Design a protein around this ligand. Structure first.
Ligand SMILES: CCCOc1cc(C(=O)N[C@@H](Cc2ccccc2)[C@H](O)CN[C@@H](C)C(=O)NC2CCCCC2)cc(N2C=CCC2=O)c1
Length: 370
């Protein structure tokens, strides 16, 4: 009953239906593994179809404390409280959870996204105001019999709470350790483009950190890695030349509908640390993943895309365009993240996104930045 309980797209977010308060108020909530605050619009906003009305809830409790949360994109401020929360198409439980009632925001809510709040699924260590504010999933596990694990299949899609759904993936699940429990932090040990090693000290791939983040759209790479990746992708696709603004993820590239030259763009392989010493596995990303379709009726004589790999100063972010096509298991109980090929895959007749291994490495360097 949890299958297909997500709607949305990489550019605007994937969301699940939830209820808050007594009696239940229904809201669509973006699923975000890149933060740890549960927050909902709680006052009118031009882009909100509905919002949390605290005065209508008999179970609302004000915590008499404000909270401010800045993201890479957008920020909001609100008032902390607790109330009853349920997930109509998830586990049939009700939990009392912390909720930030958003009273002001900037560039956070997205016009037409159809969601009104955000569910931070990461760990308390990055919750605001601080780690004393128990995140929703922690409350869910404490208050119910739900196993300490969830999985995401972003396509709509599915959030499976408390378990793994075999119908949602094919082949084997490969696991990489969660290096530290704050973000879902992982370690990348190698990057290839078209099979060619970027040939970089592997700490560079994780400079600062690397995280798995359903709330970010792009694959975001540390500047040094980003520049090297663009150089390699340019070289592979050199039979066509694009403006610098395309590679900067600013402007669209368009082709006559149906004629997108997928074959001239390379596959990207990200090798993740395995659960055994010096062992790794790789996930492979097709251009159908990293060239993000931009729907616009005005341009619809063409298919147009944005380059969805971009620069970061805060480490690697494996965003939604990376997670799409994979089934991703956030195995909190065992401190690991699993990857498998998703049942909803976009591969043409020549290449297929993959999760595969094992691979071994001779260089004993720890790739974590620290
Ligand atoms: C759903 C996709 C929306 O599009 C987007 C969204 C974001 C973005 O900032 N997403 C937020 C949530 C959001 C969801 C929806 C709207 C706004 C924010 C997510 O939490 C980001 N996670 C990490 C990186 C983070 O910044 N954590 C915070 C640390 C401090 C404490 C609070 C958590 C970046 C983005 N970017 C920016 C550059 C390239 C890219 O893809 C495109």
């Amino acid at each position: 009953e949890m299958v297909d309980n997500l709607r949305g797209k990489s550019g605007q977010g994937y969301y699940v239906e939830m209820t808050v308060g007594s009696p239940p108020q229904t809201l669509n909530i973006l699923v975000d593994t890149g933060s740890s605050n549960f927050a909902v619009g709680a006052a009118p906003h031009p882009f909100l179809h509905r919002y949390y009305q605290r005065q209508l809830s008999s179970t609302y409790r004000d915590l008499r404390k404000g909270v401010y949360v800045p993201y890479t994109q957008g920020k909001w401020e609100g008032e902390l409280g607790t109330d009853l929360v349920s997930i109509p198409h998830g586990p049939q439980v009700t939990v009392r959870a912390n909720i930030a009632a958003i009273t002001e925001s900037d560039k956070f809510f997205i016009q037409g996204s159809n969601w009104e709040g955000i569910l931070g699924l990461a760990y308390a260590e990055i919750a605001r105001p601080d780690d004393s504010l128990e995140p929703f999933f922690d409350s869910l596990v404490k208050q119910t019999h739900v196993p300490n694990l969830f999985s995401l299949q972003l396509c709509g899609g599915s959030m499976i709470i408390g378990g793994i759904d075999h119908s949602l993936y094919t082949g084997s699940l490969w696991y990489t350790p969660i290096r530290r429990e704050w973000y879902y932090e992982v370690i990348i040990v190698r990057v290839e483009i078209n099979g060619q090693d970027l040939k970089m000290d592997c700490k560079e791939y994780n400079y600062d950190k690397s995280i798995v983040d359903s709330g970010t759209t792009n694959l975001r790479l540390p500047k040094k890695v980003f520049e090297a990746a663009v150089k390699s992708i340019k070289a592979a696709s050199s039979t066509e030349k694009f403006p610098d603004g395309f590679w900067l993820g600013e402007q669209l590239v368009c082709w006559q509908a149906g004629t997108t030259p997928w074959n001239i763009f390379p596959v990207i392989s990200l090798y993740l640390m395995g659960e055994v010493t010096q062992q790794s596995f790789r996930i492979t990303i097709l251009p159908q993943q990293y060239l993000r379709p931009v729907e616009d009726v005005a341009t619809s004589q063409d298919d147009c895309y944005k380059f969805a790999i971009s620069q970061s100063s805060t480490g690697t972010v494996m965003g939604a365009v990376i997670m799409e096509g994979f089934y991703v298991v956030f195995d909190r109980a065992r401190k690991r993240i699993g990857f498998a090929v998703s049942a909803c895959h976009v591969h043409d007749e020549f290449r297929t996104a993959a999760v595969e291994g094992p691979f071994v490495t001779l260089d004993m360097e720890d790739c974590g930045y620290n």
